[PDB]
Amino acid sequence: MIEIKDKQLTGLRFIDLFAGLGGFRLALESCGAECVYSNEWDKYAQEVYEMNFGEKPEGDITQVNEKTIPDHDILCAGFPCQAFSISGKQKGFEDSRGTLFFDIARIVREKKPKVVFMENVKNFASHDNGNTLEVVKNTMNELDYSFHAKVLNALDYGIPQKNERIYMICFRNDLNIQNFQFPKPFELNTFVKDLLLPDSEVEHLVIDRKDLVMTNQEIEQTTPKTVRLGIVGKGGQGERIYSTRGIAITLSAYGGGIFAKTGGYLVNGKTRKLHPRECARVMGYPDSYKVHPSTSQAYKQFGNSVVINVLQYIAYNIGSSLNFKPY
DNA sequence: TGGATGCGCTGAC
DNA sequence: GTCAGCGCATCC
Ligand SMILES: Nc1ncnc2c1ncn2[C@@H]1O[C@H](CSCC[C@H](N)C(=O)O)[C@@H](O)[C@H]1O
């Protein structure tokens, strides 16, 4: 994550829904905002969240009386994506995990914050012939909010990640916000190789599969894209090896394959998956952030997470717009 | 809502 | 045809 000198969100309160690791919290706090509520029902996510912020998030949002939620200015919510991801079955709202957005609407309808900042996977934008995004848009409009949605690729904002997500920023209409803009892309100067840990700390992640098939030659020049170098097994998810001279493939929460949830990389002649600390780094997390003691849970958590830097630029722009109040 | 890995199918070229 | 995906069902 980057340092923010002009703290555009100073004096603003926000809630961290579907908190997870608290990526939205790191991003908004870096801009000066104060978190006044967090909700996360996963046992392990609650532990790491508490480990880093000192508080246990409240559980299952579907059972929380929205009236009990503290007053806040900005509602943050990177809601469940298994039901909308290109990698899943796409049952969308038909999925028991795909109706959480309506819980968000319920809370918005009651607390009416100034801003609603949501995040979901790229496919959410086109799922069900665009009907899914349209439903969210109309719901927010009904609630008297403007709706700004755009897919941003993390590689355009200083993080070597193919992470592509749809970001939705909603402003309560009475605020008459007309200058909100998504961050403009800038040149990537950091690549996977730059965030890797020393070899001595990741020897245990090195795997030598005799069914490894190098398909492409290693590149010597860094490039802002994923560069596949080979595969193991049939080359399915978690069975693809990439160049550290390129960018990291999207992390996943329930991913499989021998290089589960991170993908495989060619590092000094060896092939290995990423270390939880490396996952944290490719997601924009500071080294000061404490990962969960279970590597399996840590991989899952970062796989579900957001790229901090991207949320930082968005948060900064949200604040920039809320502060432009000329006479 | 354990940890691990082989897998298969969709979306966007 | 190419390839990537906050995933899935199953095994212990
Ligand atoms: N009904 C529910 N109540 C509370 N949390 C829920 C929930 N259903 C799913 N979640 C949590 O929603 C999260 C969605 S992933 C969001 C991760 C978050 N942005 C962070 O930066 O990491 C998951 O951690 C999941 O455990």
Give the CATH number, domain containing residue A130.
3.40.50.150
The C1' atom of B1 and the CA atom of A33 lie apart, in whole Å, by: 30
| C-alpha distances out from residue A253 to A13, A75, A170, A179, Å | 29, 23, 27, 35
Q: What are phi and psi of A308, to 5 degrees?
A: -50, -50
This structure was determined by X-ray
The set of strand C positions with any atom below 7 Å of a protein CB reads 3-9
Q: What are phi and psi of A152, to 5 degrees?
A: -120, 135
Q: Which residues contact A231 (CB under 8 A, 6 or more apart)?
A: A212, A213, A215, A239, A240, A241
Are A150 and A297 in a shared domain? yes
Q: Are A233 and A211 in contact (CB under 8 A)?
A: yes
Are A24 and A161 in a shared domain? yes
The token pair that represents A121 in the structure block: 């996977």
Q: Are A57 and A39 in contact (CB under 8 A)?
A: yes
Are A56 and A132 in a shared domain? yes
Q: Which nucleotide is nearest to A258 (CA to C1')?
A: B5
| Distance (Å, whole) CA A192 – CA A208 | 21
**Residue nearest atom 3 in ligand 1 by C-alpha distance:** A60
Q: Where are the alpha helices (DSSP H) in chain A?
A: 23-30, 43-53, 101-111, 131-142, 192-195, 276-282, 295-304, 308-323
Residue A269 C-beta-side C-alpha neighbours within 13 Å? 0
Question: How does DSSP classify residue A7?
Answer: -
Last residue of a domain, one of A267, A284, A301: A284
Q: Where are the alpha helices (DSSP H) in A192-275?
A: 192-195
Catalytic residue among A35, A81, A170, A279: A81
Q: Which residues contact A198 (CB under 8 A, 6 or more apart)?
A: none
Are A144 and A256 in a shared domain? no
Query: Which 3-state string (H, E, C) describes A179-192?
Result: CCCCCCCCCCCCCH
Burial group, residue A236, by CB count within 10 angstroms (0-12, 13-18, 19+): exposed
* CA A65-A101-A86 angle, 5° bins: 150
CB atoms within 10 A of CB A17: 26
| C-alpha distances out from residue A186 to A10, A149, A324, Å | 26, 19, 24
Q: For chain A, what is the domain count?
A: 2
**Residue A81 is a catalytic residue:** yes
| Distance (Å, whole) CA A208 – CA A267 | 12
Ligand 1 atom with minimal separation from the A97 CA: 8
Question: Which residue in A326, A323, A248, A327 sits closest to A12, CA to CA?
Answer: A323
Q: A273 forms bridges with which residues in the sheet?
A: A264
Q: Please report the resolution in angstroms.
A: 2.0
Give the CATH number, domain containing residue A271.
3.90.120.10
The token pair that represents A39 in the structure block: 């909700």
Question: Which residue in A70, A12, A312 sits closest to A182, CA to CA?
Answer: A312
Question: How does DSSP classify residue A161?
Answer: B
Which domain, by its residues, includes A201? 187-284
Are A180 and A143 in a shared domain? yes
| Distance (Å, whole) CA A296 – CA A195 | 20
